[PDB]
């Protein structure tokens, strides 16, 4: 039965704490790979006060997040602070933000109807007055359209709810993609705006949070869909 296996695949992710899950379901992004792409692009979103979620840096001062994040700020851009490449120390105890941190100058609060939750943010330059271009390197957008059910990738981003310090790789399974994206995978609430990265690197769709599946008792991750339509309409900002 349907529900059964749905119940049955949720389990190999929730089934177990997930500091018990294995490494190639959910594990910590190393300061090594954080330098590299895909890796770079992703960062913590902060609301202050109010959220603590993701974004991926998408060029040119800019960012995008979940329209359900942003709209905290209540169109104040300084409530805004993205840290790109944070982690942990070696020993845990401290946290080490590789390219220090950002400032909003202002939200773009869901500019492709509340149809779609997806916002996007543009941060002024840092105190030495560099700005987030210079320090990393953007993601790379690409369409959704060559995924399909069964089909793997990397949702990358800072599971708050579970560790606060550092960026995690969850491995995805999707369940279906023609409209938007569902699919299999540890995510927490922190994971908002994480990156769905596929084979190649590429930028492919943004997590947005959990959804009612097959009943009311159950759920699937689910996410932004990227097409060419979507690609060029962002790529009209940067």
């Not at 922190?190 to 705006?193: F, K, P, Q, V």
């Given at each position: 039965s349907d529900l059964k296996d749905h119940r049955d695949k949720w389990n190999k992710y929730y089934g177990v704490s997930p500091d018990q899950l294995s490494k190639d379901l959910f594990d910590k992004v190393s300061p090594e790979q954080i330098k590299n792409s895909p890796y770079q692009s992703v960062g913590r979103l902060n609301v202050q006060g109010e959220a603590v979620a993701t974004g991926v840096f998408i060029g040119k001062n800019t960012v995008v997040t979940n329209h359900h994040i942003a709209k905290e700020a209540k169109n104040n851009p300084s409530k805004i602070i993205f840290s790109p490449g944070r982690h942990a120390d070696e020993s845990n105890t401290g946290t080490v933000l590789p390219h220090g941190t950002f400032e909003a100058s202002e939200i773009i609060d869901a500019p492709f109807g509340t149809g779609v939750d997806i916002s996007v943010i543009i941060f002024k330059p840092n105190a030495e007055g560099k700005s987030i271009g210079d320090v990393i390197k953007a993601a790379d957008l690409g369409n959704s359209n060559s995924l399909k059910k069964g089909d793997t990738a990397n949702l990358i981003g800072y599971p708050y709810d579970f560790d606060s310090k550092n960026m995690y790789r969850s491995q995805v399974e999707f369940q279906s993609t023609d409209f938007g994206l569902k699919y299999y995978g540890y995510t927490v609430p922190?994971?908002?705006?994480s990156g769905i990265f596929n084979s190649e690197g590429k930028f492919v769709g943004l997590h947005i949070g959990k959804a009612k599946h097959i009943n009311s008792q159950n759920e699937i991750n689910y996410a932004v869909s990227f097409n060419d339509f979507l690609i060029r309409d962002l790529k009209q900002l940067i």
């Open positions: 922190g994971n908002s705006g």
